[PDB]
C-alpha cells in the first residue's frame, strides 16, 4: 500500500493510540529515541551541518531570530541543535509530560524557549511570519497523508522571509508501513516527496543520514519552503 488511506483503517484510533503510547513513555532521551540514545550526537552533528548551509551562505540567508521545534518531546533537539543557533525557540508537542520535563531538561538555556505549545500537529497553526526555521523530526509518521500536507502548508505561512522547513525522519524501503507499537507510519522517498511537492512546497535540499546503525530504517533530511 502506498497511502495512509489504505494502511490506516481507523483514523481516530491511529491518533488516540499514539497519544496513549507517548503518555506512558519515560521523559528521557532514551525515551525520545526508543533505545537509540547512543546516536543522538551523531544525529545532531549531521543536522547542524545540514542547517549551517542555509544560515551562513547567502545571499538570501536564513535568519537566526526564532525556530519552531515540532514534536519536540523533552527538547533533545531544542537543547543541542536549535538553542545554540537561534535567539529564541518555540516547542510544540502533544505529550504534556514531555513539555513539563523539558523545563528541567533544557537547563538554564531553556529560558530562551518562548512558548511550550501543547497540541497535536494536526490541530496546530504556527503564527504567521514568526519562524526562520521550523524543525520537524521523527513525527511526520504520526500524521495522515492529508494532515501532514495541510500542516506543512500552515507551516509555510509561518515562515519569515528566507525561512525554511526541515523534515528529518525514517524512510521505508517501499510503500507505507504501519508500526503497531507506537501507532505511526513510515513512508518511502517517493511518497514523502510527492506529499511535499504536491502540497505546494519547494524542495531545496535532500540528504541521506550516513553512519547509522545497520539495522535501522534509513533517515533523510529535507529542506523546504
Amino acid at each position: 500500500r502506498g497511502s495512509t488511506s489504505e494502511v490506516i483503517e481507523d483514523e481516530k484510533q491511529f491518533y488516540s493510540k499514539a497519544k496513549t503510547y507517548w503518555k506512558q513513555i519515560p521523559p528521557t532521551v532514551d525515551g525520545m529515541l526508543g533505545g537509540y540514545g547512543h546516536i543522538s550526537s551523531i544525529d545532531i552533528n549531521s543536522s547542524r551541518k545540514f542547517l549551517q548551509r542555509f544560515l551562513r551562505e547567502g545571499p538570501n540567508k536564513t535568519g537566526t531570530s526564532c525556530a519552531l521545534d515540532c514534536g519536540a518531546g523533552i527538547g533533545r533537539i531544542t537543547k543541542r541543535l536549535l538553542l545554540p543557533l537561534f535567539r529564541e525557540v518555540d516547542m510544540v508537542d502533544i505529550t504534556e509530560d514531555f513539555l513539563v520535563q523539558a523545563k528541567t531538561y533544557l537547563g538554564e538555556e531553556g529560558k530562551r524557549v518562548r512558548n511550550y505549545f501543547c497540541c497535536g500537529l494536526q490541530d496546530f497553526t504556527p503564527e504567521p511570519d514568526s519562524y526562520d526555521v521550523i524543525w520537524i523530526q521523527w513525527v511526520i509518521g504520526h500524521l495522515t497523508d492529508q494532515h501532514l500536507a495541510e500542516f506543512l502548508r500552515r507551516c509555510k505561512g509561518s515562515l519569515r522571509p528566507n525561512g525554511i522547513i526541515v523534515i528529518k525522519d525514517n524512510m521505508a524501503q517501499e510503500g507505507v508501513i504501519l508500526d503497531d507499537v507506537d501507532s505511526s507510519v513510515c513512508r518511502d522517498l517517493d511518497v514523502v516527496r510527492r506529499i511535499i511537492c504536491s502540497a505546494g512546497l519547494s524542495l531545496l535540499a535532500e540528504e541521506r543520514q550516513e553512519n547509522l546503525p545497520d539495522e535501522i530504517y534509513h533517515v533523510y533530511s529535507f529542506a523546504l519552503r
Binding site: 525520545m32 529515541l33 537509540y36 525514517n170 546503525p213 539495522e215 535501522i216 530504517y217
Partner: peptide, 4 residues
C-alpha cells in the same frame, strides 16, 4: 525515533 529511529526503528529496526
Amino acid at each position: 525515533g529511529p526503528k529496526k
